[PDB]
Amino acid sequence: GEIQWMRPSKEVGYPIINAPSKTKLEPSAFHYVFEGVKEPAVLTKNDPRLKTDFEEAIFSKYVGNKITEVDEYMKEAVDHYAGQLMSLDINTEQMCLEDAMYGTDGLEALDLSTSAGYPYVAMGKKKRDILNKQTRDTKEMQKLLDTYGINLPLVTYVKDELRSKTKVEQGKSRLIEASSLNDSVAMRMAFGNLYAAFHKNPGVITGSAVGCDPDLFWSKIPVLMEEKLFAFDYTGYDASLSPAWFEALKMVLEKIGFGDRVDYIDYLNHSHHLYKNKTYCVKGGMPSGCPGTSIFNSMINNLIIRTLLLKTYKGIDLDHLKMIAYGDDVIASYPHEVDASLLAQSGKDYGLTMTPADKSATFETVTWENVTFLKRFFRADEKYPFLIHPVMPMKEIHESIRWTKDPRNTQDHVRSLCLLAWHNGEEEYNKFLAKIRSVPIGRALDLPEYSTLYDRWLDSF
Numbered sequence: 001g002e003i004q005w006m007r008p009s010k011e012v013g014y015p016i017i018n019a020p021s022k023t024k025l026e027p028s029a030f031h032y033v034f035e036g037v038k039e040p041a042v043l044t045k046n047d048p049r050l051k052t053d054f055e056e057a058i059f060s061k062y063v064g065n066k067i068t069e070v071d072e073y074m075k076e077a078v079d080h081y082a083g084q085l086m087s088l089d090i091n092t093e094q095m096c097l098e099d100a101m102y103g104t105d106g107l108e109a110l111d112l113s114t115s116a117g118y119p120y121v122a123m124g125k126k127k128r129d130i131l132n133k134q135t136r137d138t139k140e141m142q143k144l145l146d147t148y149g150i151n152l153p154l155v156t157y158v159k160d161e162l163r164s165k166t167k168v169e170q171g172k173s174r175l176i177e178a179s180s181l182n183d184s185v186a187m188r189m190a191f192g193n194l195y196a197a198f199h200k201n202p203g204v205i206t207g208s209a210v211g212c213d214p215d216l217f218w219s220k221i222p223v224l225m226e227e228k229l230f231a232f233d234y235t236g237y238d239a240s241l242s243p244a245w246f247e248a249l250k251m252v253l254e255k256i257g258f259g260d261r262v263d264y265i266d267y268l269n270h271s272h273h274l275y276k277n278k279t280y281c282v283k284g285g286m287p288s289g290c291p292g293t294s295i296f297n298s299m300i301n302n303l304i305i306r307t308l309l310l311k312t313y314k315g316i317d318l319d320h321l322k323m324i325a326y327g328d329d330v331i332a333s334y335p336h337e338v339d340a341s342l343l344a345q346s347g348k349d350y351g352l353t354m355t356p357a358d359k360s361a362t363f364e365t366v367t368w369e370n371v372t373f374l375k376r377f378f379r380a381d382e383k384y385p386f387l388i389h390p391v392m393p394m395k396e397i398h399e400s401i402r403w404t405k406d407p408r409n410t411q412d413h414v415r416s417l418c419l420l421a422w423h424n425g426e427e428e429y430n431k432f433l434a435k436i437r438s439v440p441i442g443r444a445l446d447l448p449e450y451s452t453l454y455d456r457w458l459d460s461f
Protein backbone atom coordinates (compact mmCIF):
# COMPACT_ATOMS: atom_id res chain seq x y z
CA GLY A 1 0.00 0.00 0.00
CA GLU A 2 1.14 3.53 -0.75
CA ILE A 3 -0.15 7.01 0.09
CA GLN A 4 -0.46 8.94 -3.21
CA TRP A 5 -1.06 12.34 -1.65
CA MET A 6 -2.21 14.07 1.53
CA ARG A 7 -3.69 17.52 1.99
CA PRO A 8 -6.13 19.71 3.98
CA SER A 9 -9.65 18.29 3.77
CA LYS A 10 -11.12 21.73 3.06
CA GLU A 11 -9.07 21.83 -0.14
CA VAL A 12 -10.99 18.83 -1.47
CA GLY A 13 -14.44 19.52 0.00
CA TYR A 14 -14.45 17.77 3.37
CA PRO A 15 -14.94 18.92 7.00
CA ILE A 16 -12.62 18.45 9.95
CA ILE A 17 -13.19 15.22 11.89
CA ASN A 18 -12.86 15.25 15.67
CA ALA A 19 -11.22 12.19 17.20
CA PRO A 20 -10.90 11.65 20.98
CA SER A 21 -7.39 12.60 22.10
CA LYS A 22 -7.60 11.00 25.54
CA THR A 23 -7.31 7.28 26.25
CA LYS A 24 -10.25 5.62 28.01
CA LEU A 25 -7.74 3.19 29.55
CA GLU A 26 -6.66 3.58 33.18
CA PRO A 27 -5.33 1.36 36.01
CA SER A 28 -7.81 -1.27 37.15
CA ALA A 29 -8.31 -2.66 40.63
CA PHE A 30 -5.74 -5.28 39.67
CA HIS A 31 -2.94 -3.03 38.38
CA TYR A 32 -0.59 -3.98 41.25
CA VAL A 33 -1.79 -7.55 41.80
CA PHE A 34 -0.46 -8.76 38.45
CA GLU A 35 2.77 -8.18 36.54
CA GLY A 36 2.63 -6.12 33.36
CA VAL A 37 4.71 -3.73 31.24
CA LYS A 38 2.24 -2.38 28.66
CA GLU A 39 0.61 1.09 28.60
CA PRO A 40 -2.02 2.91 26.46
CA ALA A 41 -0.93 3.61 22.88
CA VAL A 42 -0.09 7.19 21.93
CA LEU A 43 -3.14 8.97 20.56
CA THR A 44 -1.77 12.47 19.81
CA LYS A 45 1.40 14.26 18.61
CA ASN A 46 1.95 15.96 21.98
CA ASP A 47 2.05 12.83 24.16
CA PRO A 48 5.14 13.30 26.42
CA ARG A 49 6.18 9.67 26.05
CA LEU A 50 6.83 10.15 22.32
CA LYS A 51 10.42 9.92 21.09
CA THR A 52 9.73 10.66 17.41
CA ASP A 53 7.29 12.32 15.02
CA PHE A 54 3.88 10.75 15.58
CA GLU A 55 2.32 11.44 12.16
CA GLU A 56 5.37 9.92 10.48
CA ALA A 57 5.27 6.84 12.71
CA ILE A 58 1.60 5.94 12.23
CA PHE A 59 1.64 6.34 8.45
CA SER A 60 4.97 4.57 7.95
CA LYS A 61 3.08 1.25 7.74
CA TYR A 62 2.56 1.94 4.04
CA VAL A 63 5.78 0.37 2.77
CA GLY A 64 4.74 0.87 -0.84
CA ASN A 65 3.72 -1.48 -3.65
CA LYS A 66 6.14 -4.12 -4.89
CA ILE A 67 4.03 -5.50 -7.75
CA THR A 68 1.70 -4.01 -10.36
CA GLU A 69 0.39 -7.00 -12.32
CA VAL A 70 -0.73 -10.56 -11.52
CA ASP A 71 1.90 -13.07 -12.66
CA GLU A 72 1.63 -16.73 -13.72
CA TYR A 73 1.96 -18.19 -10.21
CA MET A 74 -0.73 -15.92 -8.80
CA LYS A 75 -3.05 -16.96 -11.65
CA GLU A 76 -2.35 -20.59 -10.84
CA ALA A 77 -3.02 -19.83 -7.18
CA VAL A 78 -6.31 -18.17 -8.14
CA ASP A 79 -7.44 -21.15 -10.24
CA HIS A 80 -6.65 -23.61 -7.47
CA TYR A 81 -8.28 -21.65 -4.64
CA ALA A 82 -11.27 -20.67 -6.75
CA GLY A 83 -11.67 -24.36 -7.58
CA GLN A 84 -11.71 -25.37 -3.90
CA LEU A 85 -14.33 -22.78 -2.97
CA MET A 86 -16.43 -23.98 -5.87
CA SER A 87 -17.16 -27.18 -3.96
CA LEU A 88 -18.81 -25.20 -1.16
CA ASP A 89 -21.58 -24.41 -3.62
CA ILE A 90 -21.86 -20.87 -2.27
CA ASN A 91 -25.07 -18.93 -2.98
CA THR A 92 -24.17 -16.05 -5.30
CA GLU A 93 -27.39 -14.13 -4.81
CA GLN A 94 -27.12 -10.64 -3.39
CA MET A 95 -28.43 -10.40 0.18
CA CYS A 96 -31.50 -8.31 1.04
CA LEU A 97 -31.05 -5.05 2.94
CA GLU A 98 -32.79 -6.44 6.02
CA ASP A 99 -30.46 -9.39 6.55
CA ALA A 100 -27.43 -7.28 5.62
CA MET A 101 -28.49 -4.92 8.42
CA TYR A 102 -29.90 -7.17 11.12
CA GLY A 103 -28.15 -10.39 10.17
CA THR A 104 -29.37 -13.87 9.31
CA ASP A 105 -28.08 -17.45 9.55
CA GLY A 106 -24.29 -17.24 9.50
CA LEU A 107 -24.05 -13.46 9.58
CA GLU A 108 -24.28 -11.34 12.72
CA ALA A 109 -26.23 -8.09 12.80
CA LEU A 110 -24.33 -4.83 12.32
CA ASP A 111 -22.30 -3.88 15.41
CA LEU A 112 -24.05 -0.86 16.98
CA SER A 113 -21.00 0.05 19.07
CA THR A 114 -18.61 0.90 16.23
CA SER A 115 -18.30 4.17 14.31
CA ALA A 116 -20.93 4.86 11.65
CA GLY A 117 -18.22 6.57 9.61
CA TYR A 118 -18.62 9.45 7.18
CA PRO A 119 -20.69 11.57 6.96
CA TYR A 120 -22.65 10.56 10.06
CA VAL A 121 -19.69 11.16 12.36
CA ALA A 122 -19.73 14.76 11.11
CA MET A 123 -23.50 15.11 11.52
CA GLY A 124 -23.55 13.71 15.03
CA LYS A 125 -25.76 10.84 13.89
CA LYS A 126 -25.06 7.43 15.47
CA LYS A 127 -26.07 3.98 14.21
CA ARG A 128 -28.69 3.88 16.97
CA ASP A 129 -30.73 6.63 15.33
CA ILE A 130 -30.83 4.50 12.17
CA LEU A 131 -31.65 0.90 13.04
CA ASN A 132 -34.16 -0.75 15.38
CA LYS A 133 -32.86 -4.25 16.07
CA GLN A 134 -36.38 -5.17 17.21
CA THR A 135 -38.20 -3.42 14.36
CA ARG A 136 -35.77 -4.36 11.59
CA ASP A 137 -36.63 -1.10 9.85
CA THR A 138 -34.76 -0.44 6.62
CA LYS A 139 -36.61 2.73 5.63
CA GLU A 140 -34.06 4.96 7.36
CA MET A 141 -31.04 3.09 5.94
CA GLN A 142 -32.58 3.09 2.47
CA LYS A 143 -33.23 6.83 2.57
CA LEU A 144 -29.63 7.40 3.65
CA LEU A 145 -28.25 5.18 0.90
CA ASP A 146 -30.31 7.05 -1.67
CA THR A 147 -29.19 10.35 -0.14
CA TYR A 148 -25.44 9.92 0.40
CA GLY A 149 -24.69 6.93 -1.83
CA ILE A 150 -21.58 4.74 -1.63
CA ASN A 151 -17.80 4.86 -2.09
CA LEU A 152 -17.49 7.35 0.78
CA PRO A 153 -14.21 8.28 2.53
CA LEU A 154 -13.02 6.07 5.38
CA VAL A 155 -12.69 7.87 8.74
CA THR A 156 -9.33 7.28 10.46
CA TYR A 157 -9.05 6.75 14.23
CA VAL A 158 -6.00 5.93 16.29
CA LYS A 159 -6.70 2.66 18.10
CA ASP A 160 -7.04 2.95 21.88
CA GLU A 161 -5.27 -0.18 23.15
CA LEU A 162 -2.28 -1.39 25.18
CA ARG A 163 1.20 -1.39 23.56
CA SER A 164 4.78 -2.07 24.68
CA LYS A 165 7.02 0.72 25.98
CA THR A 166 9.08 0.65 22.78
CA LYS A 167 6.06 1.08 20.51
CA VAL A 168 4.76 3.91 22.70
CA GLU A 169 7.98 5.87 22.34
CA GLN A 170 8.24 5.10 18.62
CA GLY A 171 4.66 6.27 18.08
CA LYS A 172 3.83 2.91 16.56
CA SER A 173 0.11 3.20 17.23
CA ARG A 174 -2.19 0.97 15.17
CA LEU A 175 -4.92 2.68 13.13
CA ILE A 176 -8.57 2.05 12.35
CA GLU A 177 -9.93 3.10 8.95
CA ALA A 178 -13.66 2.88 9.45
CA SER A 179 -15.72 2.77 6.29
CA SER A 180 -19.06 4.57 6.10
CA LEU A 181 -22.15 2.75 7.26
CA ASN A 182 -23.35 3.07 3.66
CA ASP A 183 -20.44 1.09 2.19
CA SER A 184 -20.39 -1.44 5.00
CA VAL A 185 -24.10 -2.03 4.28
CA ALA A 186 -23.67 -2.07 0.51
CA MET A 187 -20.89 -4.63 0.80
CA ARG A 188 -22.83 -6.92 3.12
CA MET A 189 -25.63 -6.86 0.55
CA ALA A 190 -23.19 -7.78 -2.21
CA PHE A 191 -21.21 -10.41 -0.29
CA GLY A 192 -23.46 -11.33 2.63
CA ASN A 193 -23.93 -14.88 1.40
CA LEU A 194 -20.19 -15.28 0.83
CA TYR A 195 -19.65 -14.09 4.40
CA ALA A 196 -22.23 -16.57 5.68
CA ALA A 197 -20.81 -19.53 3.75
CA PHE A 198 -17.41 -18.78 5.34
CA HIS A 199 -18.64 -18.34 8.91
CA LYS A 200 -20.48 -21.66 8.67
CA ASN A 201 -17.53 -23.45 7.06
CA PRO A 202 -14.37 -22.66 9.02
CA GLY A 203 -11.75 -25.13 7.85
CA VAL A 204 -9.37 -26.07 5.05
CA ILE A 205 -11.89 -25.77 2.21
CA THR A 206 -12.42 -22.06 2.80
CA GLY A 207 -8.93 -21.93 4.25
CA SER A 208 -10.55 -19.58 6.73
CA ALA A 209 -11.37 -19.50 10.40
CA VAL A 210 -13.31 -16.25 10.78
CA GLY A 211 -16.41 -16.81 12.95
CA CYS A 212 -14.94 -19.88 14.62
CA ASP A 213 -15.25 -20.85 18.30
CA PRO A 214 -11.77 -21.88 19.54
CA ASP A 215 -13.09 -24.02 22.39
CA LEU A 216 -14.75 -26.34 19.88
CA PHE A 217 -12.81 -25.67 16.69
CA TRP A 218 -9.43 -26.53 18.19
CA SER A 219 -10.44 -30.18 18.27
CA LYS A 220 -11.19 -30.26 14.55
CA ILE A 221 -8.01 -28.57 13.29
CA PRO A 222 -5.49 -31.38 13.92
CA VAL A 223 -7.54 -33.81 11.82
CA LEU A 224 -7.58 -31.34 8.91
CA MET A 225 -3.81 -30.83 8.73
CA GLU A 226 -1.15 -32.76 6.84
CA GLU A 227 1.96 -34.35 8.36
CA LYS A 228 4.26 -31.30 8.25
CA LEU A 229 3.19 -27.96 9.66
CA PHE A 230 4.69 -24.67 8.52
CA ALA A 231 3.98 -21.11 9.61
CA PHE A 232 5.31 -17.56 9.83
CA ASP A 233 4.20 -14.07 10.86
CA TYR A 234 3.68 -11.01 8.67
CA THR A 235 4.94 -7.54 9.48
CA GLY A 236 2.29 -4.98 8.55
CA TYR A 237 0.22 -7.38 6.43
CA ASP A 238 -2.81 -5.20 5.61
CA ALA A 239 -0.72 -2.16 4.74
CA SER A 240 1.76 -4.16 2.70
CA LEU A 241 -0.70 -5.57 0.18
CA SER A 242 -0.05 -4.48 -3.41
CA PRO A 243 -2.88 -3.69 -5.86
CA ALA A 244 -2.23 -6.97 -7.67
CA TRP A 245 -3.37 -9.01 -4.67
CA PHE A 246 -6.70 -7.21 -4.95
CA GLU A 247 -6.91 -8.10 -8.64
CA ALA A 248 -6.15 -11.74 -7.81
CA LEU A 249 -9.01 -11.53 -5.26
CA LYS A 250 -11.44 -10.23 -7.91
CA MET A 251 -10.48 -13.13 -10.17
CA VAL A 252 -11.49 -15.58 -7.45
CA LEU A 253 -14.74 -13.70 -6.94
CA GLU A 254 -15.50 -13.72 -10.66
CA LYS A 255 -14.91 -17.47 -11.00
CA ILE A 256 -17.21 -18.33 -8.10
CA GLY A 257 -20.09 -16.26 -9.43
CA PHE A 258 -19.64 -12.81 -7.90
CA GLY A 259 -18.02 -11.17 -10.93
CA ASP A 260 -21.26 -9.28 -10.74
CA ARG A 261 -19.75 -6.94 -8.14
CA VAL A 262 -15.96 -7.22 -8.10
CA ASP A 263 -15.94 -3.43 -8.30
CA TYR A 264 -16.56 -3.21 -4.56
CA ILE A 265 -13.04 -4.51 -4.14
CA ASP A 266 -11.68 -1.48 -6.03
CA TYR A 267 -13.09 0.58 -3.16
CA LEU A 268 -10.85 -1.28 -0.70
CA ASN A 269 -7.81 -1.21 -3.03
CA HIS A 270 -7.86 2.42 -4.15
CA SER A 271 -9.16 4.08 -0.99
CA HIS A 272 -10.11 7.56 0.18
CA HIS A 273 -9.22 8.64 3.78
CA LEU A 274 -10.05 11.33 6.36
CA TYR A 275 -7.94 12.02 9.46
CA LYS A 276 -8.27 15.11 11.63
CA ASN A 277 -8.16 18.03 9.19
CA LYS A 278 -6.47 15.97 6.49
CA THR A 279 -7.65 13.72 3.67
CA TYR A 280 -5.35 11.29 1.85
CA CYS A 281 -5.41 8.81 -1.00
CA VAL A 282 -3.96 5.28 -0.77
CA LYS A 283 -3.14 2.78 -3.52
CA GLY A 284 -3.17 -0.78 -2.21
CA GLY A 285 -3.39 -1.71 1.47
CA MET A 286 -6.50 -3.26 3.03
CA PRO A 287 -8.44 -0.71 5.19
CA SER A 288 -7.66 -1.78 8.79
CA GLY A 289 -9.17 -2.17 12.25
CA CYS A 290 -12.52 -3.71 11.35
CA PRO A 291 -14.18 -7.18 10.89
CA GLY A 292 -15.74 -6.56 7.47
CA THR A 293 -12.32 -7.20 5.91
CA SER A 294 -11.28 -10.35 7.82
CA ILE A 295 -12.67 -12.61 5.11
CA PHE A 296 -11.06 -10.83 2.18
CA ASN A 297 -7.69 -10.84 4.00
CA SER A 298 -8.11 -14.55 4.66
CA MET A 299 -8.91 -15.17 0.99
CA ILE A 300 -5.88 -13.17 -0.08
CA ASN A 301 -3.71 -15.07 2.43
CA ASN A 302 -4.80 -18.29 0.72
CA LEU A 303 -3.68 -16.78 -2.61
CA ILE A 304 -0.31 -15.67 -1.16
CA ILE A 305 0.74 -18.97 0.47
CA ARG A 306 -0.24 -20.76 -2.74
CA THR A 307 1.72 -18.31 -4.91
CA LEU A 308 4.92 -18.50 -2.86
CA LEU A 309 4.72 -22.30 -2.83
CA LEU A 310 4.40 -22.38 -6.63
CA LYS A 311 7.23 -19.89 -7.18
CA THR A 312 9.54 -21.68 -4.72
CA TYR A 313 8.59 -25.32 -5.18
CA LYS A 314 7.57 -25.97 -8.76
CA GLY A 315 5.50 -29.13 -8.94
CA ILE A 316 4.09 -28.79 -5.43
CA ASP A 317 0.67 -30.39 -4.96
CA LEU A 318 -1.62 -27.57 -3.79
CA ASP A 319 -4.33 -30.20 -3.36
CA HIS A 320 -2.27 -31.26 -0.36
CA LEU A 321 -1.74 -27.82 1.05
CA LYS A 322 -3.95 -27.63 4.16
CA MET A 323 -4.15 -24.17 5.65
CA ILE A 324 -6.45 -22.06 7.78
CA ALA A 325 -6.17 -18.29 7.91
CA TYR A 326 -7.70 -15.55 10.05
CA GLY A 327 -6.69 -12.38 8.30
CA ASP A 328 -2.90 -12.39 8.35
CA ASP A 329 -2.68 -15.10 11.00
CA VAL A 330 -2.16 -18.58 9.56
CA ILE A 331 -1.44 -22.19 10.39
CA ALA A 332 -0.51 -24.36 7.38
CA SER A 333 0.64 -27.86 6.46
CA TYR A 334 1.87 -30.14 3.66
CA PRO A 335 2.92 -33.81 3.46
CA HIS A 336 6.54 -32.74 3.00
CA GLU A 337 8.77 -30.38 4.91
CA VAL A 338 9.18 -26.87 3.47
CA ASP A 339 11.52 -24.02 4.36
CA ALA A 340 9.72 -20.99 5.80
CA SER A 341 12.79 -18.77 5.34
CA LEU A 342 13.00 -19.67 1.65
CA LEU A 343 9.31 -18.89 1.32
CA ALA A 344 10.00 -15.71 3.28
CA GLN A 345 12.55 -14.77 0.64
CA SER A 346 10.12 -15.37 -2.25
CA GLY A 347 7.69 -13.18 -0.35
CA LYS A 348 9.82 -10.02 -0.46
CA ASP A 349 9.31 -9.97 -4.22
CA TYR A 350 5.56 -9.89 -3.69
CA GLY A 351 5.58 -7.02 -1.20
CA LEU A 352 5.16 -9.20 1.89
CA THR A 353 7.56 -9.10 4.85
CA MET A 354 7.54 -12.55 6.48
CA THR A 355 9.28 -13.46 9.74
CA PRO A 356 9.69 -16.45 12.12
CA ALA A 357 6.57 -17.83 13.77
CA ASP A 358 5.82 -16.32 17.19
CA LYS A 359 8.56 -13.69 17.35
CA SER A 360 11.36 -16.27 17.02
CA ALA A 361 14.78 -15.01 15.85
CA THR A 362 15.30 -17.85 13.38
CA PHE A 363 12.97 -20.05 11.33
CA GLU A 364 12.55 -23.22 13.39
CA THR A 365 10.52 -26.31 12.56
CA VAL A 366 6.86 -25.81 13.48
CA THR A 367 5.39 -28.65 15.54
CA TRP A 368 2.14 -29.41 17.37
CA GLU A 369 3.93 -28.50 20.57
CA ASN A 370 5.11 -25.02 19.56
CA VAL A 371 2.59 -23.81 17.00
CA THR A 372 0.06 -21.13 17.91
CA PHE A 373 -3.01 -19.85 16.09
CA LEU A 374 -4.80 -16.74 17.32
CA LYS A 375 -2.16 -16.54 20.06
CA ARG A 376 -3.33 -19.92 21.31
CA PHE A 377 -1.30 -23.13 21.68
CA PHE A 378 -2.79 -26.61 21.22
CA ARG A 379 -2.89 -29.05 24.12
CA ALA A 380 -4.69 -32.37 24.29
CA ASP A 381 -6.80 -32.78 27.43
CA GLU A 382 -5.34 -35.18 29.97
CA LYS A 383 -8.53 -37.14 30.58
CA TYR A 384 -9.91 -37.05 27.04
CA PRO A 385 -6.97 -36.76 24.55
CA PHE A 386 -9.30 -36.29 21.60
CA LEU A 387 -10.52 -33.01 23.10
CA ILE A 388 -8.05 -30.23 22.27
CA HIS A 389 -7.47 -27.24 24.58
CA PRO A 390 -6.85 -23.81 23.05
CA VAL A 391 -4.17 -22.43 25.41
CA MET A 392 -3.41 -18.72 25.68
CA PRO A 393 -0.41 -18.00 27.95
CA MET A 394 -1.28 -16.14 31.17
CA LYS A 395 1.09 -13.29 30.27
CA GLU A 396 -1.21 -11.46 27.84
CA ILE A 397 -4.13 -12.16 30.18
CA HIS A 398 -2.22 -10.53 33.04
CA GLU A 399 -1.43 -7.51 30.86
CA SER A 400 -5.09 -7.09 30.01
CA ILE A 401 -6.53 -7.34 33.51
CA ARG A 402 -4.30 -4.51 34.78
CA TRP A 403 -6.35 -1.91 32.91
CA THR A 404 -9.99 -0.97 32.50
CA LYS A 405 -12.04 0.97 29.94
CA ASP A 406 -15.24 1.21 31.96
CA PRO A 407 -15.73 0.22 35.63
CA ARG A 408 -19.22 -0.85 34.57
CA ASN A 409 -17.73 -3.67 32.46
CA THR A 410 -15.32 -5.07 35.05
CA GLN A 411 -17.51 -8.12 35.54
CA ASP A 412 -17.66 -8.91 31.80
CA HIS A 413 -14.02 -8.09 31.20
CA VAL A 414 -12.76 -10.37 34.00
CA ARG A 415 -15.15 -13.17 33.00
CA SER A 416 -13.84 -12.87 29.44
CA LEU A 417 -10.34 -13.42 30.72
CA CYS A 418 -11.42 -16.38 32.81
CA LEU A 419 -12.73 -18.16 29.72
CA LEU A 420 -9.27 -17.81 28.22
CA ALA A 421 -7.18 -18.62 31.29
CA TRP A 422 -8.75 -21.79 32.69
CA HIS A 423 -7.27 -23.71 29.75
CA ASN A 424 -3.86 -23.24 31.38
CA GLY A 425 -4.72 -25.78 34.06
CA GLU A 426 -6.42 -25.93 37.44
CA GLU A 427 -3.32 -24.96 39.44
CA GLU A 428 -2.74 -21.83 37.34
CA TYR A 429 -6.42 -20.93 37.17
CA ASN A 430 -6.85 -21.12 40.93
CA LYS A 431 -3.85 -18.82 41.51
CA PHE A 432 -5.46 -16.45 39.02
CA LEU A 433 -8.78 -16.45 40.91
CA ALA A 434 -7.07 -16.05 44.31
CA LYS A 435 -5.17 -12.94 43.20
CA ILE A 436 -8.36 -11.47 41.77
CA ARG A 437 -10.05 -12.15 45.12
CA SER A 438 -7.22 -10.44 47.02
CA VAL A 439 -8.77 -7.00 46.44
CA PRO A 440 -12.37 -5.77 47.10
CA ILE A 441 -13.41 -5.36 43.45
CA GLY A 442 -12.48 -8.96 42.72
CA ARG A 443 -14.24 -10.46 45.73
CA ALA A 444 -17.45 -8.88 44.48
CA LEU A 445 -17.29 -10.48 41.02
CA ASP A 446 -19.26 -13.56 40.01
CA LEU A 447 -16.59 -15.85 38.53
CA PRO A 448 -16.75 -19.55 37.53
CA GLU A 449 -14.59 -22.10 39.31
CA TYR A 450 -12.47 -24.60 37.35
CA SER A 451 -14.63 -27.72 37.60
CA THR A 452 -17.53 -25.56 36.37
CA LEU A 453 -15.69 -24.44 33.24
CA TYR A 454 -14.37 -27.96 32.60
CA ASP A 455 -17.89 -29.42 32.83
CA ARG A 456 -19.30 -26.69 30.63
CA TRP A 457 -16.61 -27.42 28.04
CA LEU A 458 -17.19 -31.19 27.93
CA ASP A 459 -20.89 -30.35 27.52
CA SER A 460 -20.41 -27.88 24.64
CA PHE A 461 -19.23 -30.52 22.17
Ligand code: NA
Pocket (backbone or CB within 6 Å): 001, 268, 269, 270, 271, 282, 283, 284, 285, 286, 287
Ligand atom coordinates in the same frame (compact mmCIF):
# COMPACT_ATOMS: atom_id res chain seq x y z
NA1 NA B 1 -6.49 0.97 0.02
